Design an enzyme around this catalytic site. Sequence first.
Site: not given
Length: 262
Positions: A132, A178, A209
Amino acid sequence: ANPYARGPNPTAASLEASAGPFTVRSFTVSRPSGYGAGTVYYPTNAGGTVGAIAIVPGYTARQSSIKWWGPRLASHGFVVITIDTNSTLDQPESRSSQQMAALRQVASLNGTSSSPIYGKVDTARMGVMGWSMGGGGSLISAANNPSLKAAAPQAPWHSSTNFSSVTVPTLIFACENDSIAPVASSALPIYDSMSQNAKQFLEICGGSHSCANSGNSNQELIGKKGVAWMKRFMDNDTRYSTFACENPNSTAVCDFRTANCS
């Protein structure tokens, strides 16, 4: 012969296994230099120097989220540092600085006679990974440091999707479902921006995610691809060319793209 080739010739089974061929040990970094905390994973019996990979978590996250990569990669012949950031709320640019500081410290420890990794690292061969904002930070690290040999972020995000400057071989893991950094507005645009490099995009079916984090149910596929990419590009190891470039036969693949792979 390739001076960087380590370990036995790969097979699908050997890359899908929980562990590679080398025995792994680990230690906590005693005085983290430029980042919050770190754990170093290393092979005890690799039989030559190995490259180093630095891995950064996402916003609010810690080493736990990314720890599974440490043994998985180190067992195939890499020194891997997983970090905590100075703040859990650090943004991508800060995460990139701290990732590079962690690689610097692995180079320091390779020259420190008391360290378990004394003389184990080829400090000219490094790679970057992260989740991320830590994945966005990995892409910033690659853009800023084109001598890095490979990047393999997962569910990346950055405030800009334009990574056209990146010349480093880059594998992007993405997670279909996600809701934090939707594939269509984050990972896929980032992938599409990169024009100068070997690159690949692998999206996991049904994935949230956290689909490439510690505890995921696709460690066979994700671990095969991450280790194959790093072997191919950090070690120039063309024994891994087909594993690195292929569209894998898996029910878990919901989107696959690759370019300039060999």
